[PDB]
Amino acid sequence: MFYPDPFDVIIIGGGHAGTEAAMAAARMGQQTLLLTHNIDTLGQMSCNPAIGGIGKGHLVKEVDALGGLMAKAIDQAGIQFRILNASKGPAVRATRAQADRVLYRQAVRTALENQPNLMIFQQAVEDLIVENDRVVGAVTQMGLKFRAKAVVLTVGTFLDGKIHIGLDNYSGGRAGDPPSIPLSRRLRELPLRVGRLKTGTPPRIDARTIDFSVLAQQHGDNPMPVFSFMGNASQHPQQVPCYITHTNEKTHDVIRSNLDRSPMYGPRYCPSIEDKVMRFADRNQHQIFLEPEGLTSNEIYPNGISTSLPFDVQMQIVRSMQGMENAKIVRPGYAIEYDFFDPRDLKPTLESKFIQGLFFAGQINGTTGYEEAAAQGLLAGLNAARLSADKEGWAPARSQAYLGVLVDDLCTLGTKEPYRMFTSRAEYRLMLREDNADLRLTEIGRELGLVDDERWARFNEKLENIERERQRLKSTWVTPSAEAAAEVNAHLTAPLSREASGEDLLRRPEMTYEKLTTLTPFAPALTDEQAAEQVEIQVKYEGYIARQQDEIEKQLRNENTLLPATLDYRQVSGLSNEVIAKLNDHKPASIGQASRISGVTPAAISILLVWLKKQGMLRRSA
Amino acid sequence: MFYPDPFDVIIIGGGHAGTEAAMAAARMGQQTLLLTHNIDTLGQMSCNPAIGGIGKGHLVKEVDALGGLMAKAIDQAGIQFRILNASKGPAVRATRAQADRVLYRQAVRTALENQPNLMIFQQAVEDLIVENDRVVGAVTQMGLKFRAKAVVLTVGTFLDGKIHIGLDNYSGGRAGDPPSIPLSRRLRELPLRVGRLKTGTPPRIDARTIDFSVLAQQHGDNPMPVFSFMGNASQHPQQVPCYITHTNEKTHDVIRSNLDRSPMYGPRYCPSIEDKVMRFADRNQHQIFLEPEGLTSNEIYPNGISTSLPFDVQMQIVRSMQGMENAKIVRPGYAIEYDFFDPRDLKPTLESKFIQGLFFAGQINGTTGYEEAAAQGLLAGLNAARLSADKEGWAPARSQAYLGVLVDDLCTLGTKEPYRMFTSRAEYRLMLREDNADLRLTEIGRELGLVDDERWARFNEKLENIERERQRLKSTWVTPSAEAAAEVNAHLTAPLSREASGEDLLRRPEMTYEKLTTLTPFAPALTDEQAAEQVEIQVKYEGYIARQQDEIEKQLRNENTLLPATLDYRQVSGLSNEVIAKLNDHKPASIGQASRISGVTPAAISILLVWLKKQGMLRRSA
Ligand SMILES: Cc1cc2nc3c(=O)[nH]c(=O)nc-3n(C[C@H](O)[C@H](O)[C@H](O)COP(=O)(O)OP(=O)(O)OC[C@H]3O[C@@H](n4cnc5c(N)ncnc54)[C@H](O)[C@@H]3O)c2cc1C
Ligand SMILES: Cc1cc2nc3c(=O)[nH]c(=O)nc-3n(C[C@H](O)[C@H](O)[C@H](O)COP(=O)(O)OP(=O)(O)OC[C@H]3O[C@@H](n4cnc5c(N)ncnc54)[C@H](O)[C@@H]3O)c2cc1C
Structure with a gap:
């Protein structure tokens, strides 16, 4: 019955989120176990065989920058590659690839199959083990059951799904796969709220x-x-x-x-x-x-x-x-209906606010799309392996990753549509670009040990390149009477009238980077243009980035002020009944997250701060 | 409901037998339709990932010589190749390949997916349509049902199978696939006899x-x-x-x-x-x-x-x-139990003796192994497409193919073991070799239109080579006093004492082919050694082949004498009660096949011949 080896983290379901969770957990030096229905389905695409797009490529780049596999299984499986919004500003471009399905499946399986500190197992699950608000171990179908310090569920659309065609239906997880019926009941009996959604695919x-x-x-x-x-x-x-x-x-x-x-x-x-x-x-x-x-x-x-x-x-x-x-x-077209959990009872670290050690990721979080599951699974595995090793967890904010925006919106949106990521859905587009994802995530990956030596060396070299380019461009000066300034004035409008400089020379919008690099001063650009585009982006967007940075720095206190899930808002004086019901239903994690809820006003948060100061549940609010 | 296009033949189940049946039917210029559970499982190996062996390589060679795909999907998927019995006589060698699984799966899928006159469809079947002892059309799960002039079933082990581990069990077609439950009942209600078998696989x-x-x-x-x-x-x-x-x-x-x-x-x-x-x-x-x-x-x-x-x-x-x-x-090890039909109610053309147009192939014929299903499926598809075009069918004999031996044994064995092919199980081993399978099957394939132009040209060239080699070796003569005979006598025992010849020179067992080719006479051998080995085999085995040929020619009359399935042996005088019951149970197709049954003696067949002559059910018996 009991398996004679205890593991650190167990992932249930090796789909698009489970694989990322397992890779992240194993690469962080923790014994990882992965239970799945059946193998050779790892990396299967059950819909449009495409990767990336507007709002989806950003998630792929974030997963890659932090040590993912989706961006590496696509470089050896893509049969068409395009850039969307190539003519617009660099902050809005995206990359979309029509992918060969078999090459992707094999790249995924082979990469996952040779991962140290990880083991795979082919078996369904039928129940879980919980005592005193703690989840420890899972039960399979044959009778064998495991023990672990953390469990992550990535069921997806297999939680008791029905295939619908016309006015007829039959049980099925998808085209050709069986459903996971009993686990739906076992999760339903647990104090959670469950709903149903439906989506279809053509022939x-x-x-x-x-x-x-x-x-x-x-x-x-x-x-x-x-x-x-x-x-x-x-x-x-x-x-x-x-x-x-x-x-x-x-x-x-x-x-x-x-x-x-x-x-x-x-x-x-x-x-x-x-x-x-x-x-x-x-x-x-x-x-x-x-x-x-x-x-x-x-x-x-x-x-x-x-x-x-x-x-x-x-x-x-x-x-x-x-x-x-x-x-x-x-292959005839068909729709499917599947269960999901409302994303208002889990912490921003994708951990259920009621159970200790239970995590959720994938379609069960009320989302859709391949890219919307990999980031959730990776973050869930990261947090689970941090918890199993008895260290503080981590969760990104809205100002440093699209994952932070996705988690925050799923926590405090309340709508019923399947969640699809869009570029305009995030309020920090001008800095949450694609080319700079590594620049803002790989250092965190290294700190938590999600990044190996090759990526570290590449990023260190790239950062050195960027810094040296910034300094050398800052170290130039030109005058209107300069010997080579005749041509400078010839192909540049508004000729020089005082001391000029390249850092100021490029401030004109019509000028580009490569054009300035072709000049008597401003020596030939560095061979690595991937680092070269960064300085152009920074100089073009410096003002807006500075404004947004000093904006973000101001809400940090509200971001830090946490609200425990045991809080009973009925014990607060001065708040309206509707606001009390709303806050009791949502149960936010921070006062800033609560303020983002629709229906709460600054008066409510001010009264809440006064109550917190009265009860001493806050060290300070500055 | 009814699909608006009628097809010639419908295969139910694209496994190891269904694919061969579909390829054979489509290549013979008949509109072919293939129904399957789910795609990307075409060519899946659910057991030991090996191809060929003793008694299995012969079937692979027979399938290849007649226009199969198994031998072509292994040349691009094998990761180890060996010859078994290499040191013994050439009639007993075999070739065994440890195969990469994914390369085989993809070769099979891509070869099957681009076959003219054939179409594939992903859907289960739930019932069949029969009226007046004729099967016309099949019913799927959604509601859509098709019409055709012939139907072939290649379910395999999915006819209501249970997975067993220890003392526990659960429904499943195999590890990760669902079972086909209702079709088992639908086939059981039909006047057939069904049993159950069980086999297992390690972790x-x-x-x-x-x-x-x-x-x-x-x-x-x-x-x-x-x-x-x-x-x-x-x-x-x-x-x-x-x-x-x-x-x-x-x-x-x-x-x-x-x-x-x-x-x-x-x-x-x-x-x-x-x-x-x-x-x-x-x-x-x-x-x-x-x-x-x-x-x-x-x-x-x-x-x-x-x-x-x-x-x-x-x-x-x-x-x-x-x-x-x-x-x-x-992956834990496990066993499975599945239904099957006793192979005593179908004609040697793999057609049920009771229903018109219904065919059986694969594991449901009480067999096991990849190679034991491809030949059955190919022959079933061949016969089905011949029937749909209103032409006489075909079935090989025990003297020209291992398929004939396999069919004859499955018809008149009566044992309970899963049928495994062995070299010694056939009585015509000395001519039923591997290297000569094309020489005895590709002309039949061409006559029935199963062979395209490339194979025809290759076989014609090979036959021309063989004939020219035979004639040139027949056109030589040596004498003991020959000028170059000194060395001939030196490295050959029993020196020449009279007029010699190479057709007689090679008759010595110690001499080989290549040694004689590298001599003063007998000019260098032909570059195609694949044709060269044939003449060596023929000259070494001529006597035994001649004896077996004149043996086989004598039973041809008993082979030709057919026995209709409507025959009632209770209306025959002079036969014992036990023999009557035995013959009524088996219902053979020919008097020779009846004679191969255990428990019948030459007296019984003589009395049967007398009765047939009395009733005029035979034109002549000579
Ligand atoms: C009919 C249909 C319609 C679709 N429509 C859309 C659409 O409109 N838009 C869109 O963006 N995408 C659509 N998709 C694609 C869909 O979003 C993805 O295929 C998938 O749901 C996302 O991956 P995931 O990891 O979240 O889930 P999945 O890939 O479904 O995760 C399931 C995986 O985990 C394993 N697993 C699950 N539960 C268990 C368990 N209990 N024990 C062990 N292993 C388990 C399974 O074996 C499988 O490998 C559609 C797909 C289908 C089939
Ligand atoms: C547990 C286990 C033990 C085994 N033990 C042995 C052993 O001891 N020795 C040995 O030689 N081999 C063994 N095997 C291998 C086995 O013999 C082969 O994998 C297989 O059974 C032979 O291929 P087939 O074409 O006859 O049947 P299968 O490959 O089982 O045929 C099934 C195929 O047809 C399709 N299909 C079936 N029914 C339908 C339907 N109604 N509608 C549509 N599509 C359908 C399925 O989707 C599938 O593609 C074992 C396999 C397993 C799983």
Whole structure:
């Protein structure tokens, strides 16, 4: 029954969050154990085979900078690479890759399979062990049960999910996988609140039944970009293009005629295609993408045609488009409904506020997307391994990582939509960029021992480069009567009228970095342009960064002021009943987090501070 | 409900038999449809990751010679290659390959995914449609149902299987896959007889917890062999070795002490390890192999330590061996029990004798092993596509293929062991070799259109080579007083005493082929030694082949004399009651097949022939 070796941390579920949690826990020198249903599914993509995008590439870069694997399994599995918002400011660009599925699966499995201090085990779980608000050990299906000092759950969408097609349904965790039914009941009996969500995916087409000779092609950028701060372009496999098609009035007529057979007729947008036509009935054209699932299989994923209509309607819609006159379907489209937990009963370190040692990550945190789970899993594993070693935990803030924004929003949003990350959703966009993620996370990774020697050496060299470039550009001066100033004045507007300097010379918006590096002064730029772009970003954004920094420094006291979960706001005088109910329901962790809740005003926080000072539950508030 | 396109043949289950059936049916120019649970499992190996062996390599060669895929997916996925019985006569050699699992899975999937006239579909089946002893169409789970002129079932071990560990059990098709429960009931209600069998598999070890520094290594053959008659050695990936270890008295003591916890305490041999110790208690040492599952994962398969004991005993046995003092297990060992059909109610063309159009192949035919299913599936698909096109079927005999022996034995054996192919199990070993499989099967493949142009050209060139070599060796003559005969007499015993010839010169057993080719006469051999070995085999085995040929030619009349399944042997005078019951139970297809049944004597077949002549159910018997 009892396994004769105790472990530090146990992860239940090796999906997109469990793998990151296990890697982070094992790399931090703690004995790690990973339980999963079945192997060879590690790294499986059950949806659109794409990685990154607007708001998703930032999370990938954050995971990579702190010692992740998602950004390294994609450099050897991407079949198309593009940069989004390339023409705009560097703070908003993103990198999106159409990925070969098998290469990604194998990179993930092989990287995870050779990780020291970690062991994997193929078995389901059926219950957990808890006494005195402490979780110790998990129970498998055969009868064998383990013991550990910390447990992380990364079930995802397998918590008692049903597949829905048309008006019919059947049990299933996804296309071809079984459901984890009893664990749903076992977690439900625990004092938690559980709900249900539903999302769908379109069918798959056969590439040798589509006449691509009349379909428009689309390509990526000529210089293929990279995700990780370590690899280069020599690791990418061969490239393939994508095909673009459209719909026509016959498709809309068929959808409207057969709209009766649907469970519906809901997010604030339109995920399906019948929603696309009904919400906007005047539009008569839509864009559909056809992209290959890999360079060695002829299955095409259609993007933009997701629905929940029965099979006959699916076939008619597929067969009523240009280039799809005679098409075959290998995998029908379908939706799924799964359980989740409301993210208002766990600490910002992704630990349940009621149980000691229990952690949550992945889809069960009311989110969606591959990138929205890896960061949660990595942070959960980090905190779990810190706790098992009896040291203080860690959690990022809204001003240094998109993960901090994601956690804070999931804690104090209260909406019902699946959480999708967007660039504008964060208030510190101008500094929370992609190229500087390592510059603001790898030192923390090194302090907690998540970063090995190669990354440390690379970052030290890069920082030395940046500092030397800053100093040398600060060490130049020009005058209008300078011997070489004729050409300087020639190709620069507003010619020099006083002592000039490169740090001030570049302040003009029209000038660039490489142009200034090509000059009689301002000697040739350093060979590592990856470090060179940093100085350009800093000089262009110095004013806004300074304003935001002195802004952030002011709320630090409210960030530090903690509020214990045992607090009973009914014992506070001067606060309205609605505010008391709201604060009792949310149970924030800090006064600043409470202030971010909708419905609380500065009067409420002032009265709360007065009450805290009265009860002595605060050392000081300055 | 009804799918708007009718197909020629539908295969249910894309495993090891379904893929071959689909490829054979599609390559024969018939619209083929393949239903499966889930994709990315095509080519999965759920047991010892090895291909070929004694009696299994012959089946692989037969499948390859007739247009199969198993021999082509192994040349790009094998991590170790060996020849068994290399020192013995060429009629008994075999080729065994330790295979990388992922490369095999991907080769299979990519080869199957680009097959013209074939389409794949991911869905389970829940029932079949039959009227007036005819099967037309199958019903899926969602509700969509198809129509076809022929149906082939390749379920394997998923017909309502239970996983067993120790004294506990749970439903499962295998480790990580769901069971197909309702189809078992639907097939059971049909007038068939169904039974249950059980087999097990050992656990998996982690390669980075075993001290291989004190373990013996094993190697293959430097001159690498080949499976397919098309590829070469340039397609094989990098090679890895295998590790050898043993057991000791502590393991036996632990097994004996904890023998009480076992469902048992059965084949005529010992599959498990507790059987190994109990059946032979005097032996105190056993051989265990540790082999890598691939060149990119550190999971080790242990061969020789299969059992059904609970997990604690498994861990003790693993930890009580040299080099395994501190070992980890990633996948526990387990057994499974599954349903099957008794192979006495189907024609030798793998068609049920009662239903029209229904075919059986794979594990449901009471067999085991990868190679024992591919041939069955290929022949079933061949016969199904012949039937759907309204042409006469085909079935090999015992004298031209191991498939004929396998089918004949499964029809008229009556034992209960899982059927394993062995070389000595066939009575025509001396001609049913491996190197000549194409020479006796590819012309039939071409006649039925299973062979494309490349194989046809290669075989035509090879046959031309063989014929020219035979003629040139027949066109030589030597004399004792020949000018170059001094050396001939020097290195050959019994010097020439009369007119000699190479067709007679090689008749000496000590002489070889290459030695004669490097002589004054008998000019250098042809560059294609693959054709050159054939003439050596023919000249060494001519007498035995001639004897066996004139033997086989005599039973052809009994082979041709068919016996309809509607025959009622109770209406025959002069036969004993036991013989009547036996013949009614078996219902053979031919008088020769009936004669191969145990318990019938030549008197019975003579009386049967007399009765057939009386009733006029035979044209003639000569
Ligand atoms: C029908 C469908 C629709 C989708 N729609 C969208 C969409 O609209 N938008 C979008 O962004 N993404 C969508 N997706 C993709 C989805 O977000 C991801 O595939 C996945 O849910 C995110 O990964 P995860 O780690 O959070 O969960 P998963 O990858 O589902 O985590 C499950 C993994 O953990 C293992 N596991 C789980 N529970 C246990 C347990 N108890 N014991 C042991 N092992 C366990 C499983 O074996 C598996 O390996 C969709 C997927 C499907 C199938
Ligand atoms: C526990 C265990 C023990 C084993 N022991 C041995 C042993 O002792 N000796 C040995 O030689 N081999 C052994 N094996 C290996 C086994 O013989 C092969 O893995 C396999 O059973 C033979 O392949 P098959 O094609 O006959 O069947 P399978 O590979 O089992 O065929 C199943 C395939 O068909 C599909 N399928 C099945 N039914 C349906 C359906 N209704 N609809 C759609 N798709 C369907 C499945 O999705 C799957 O792809 C063992 C395997 C296991 C798991």
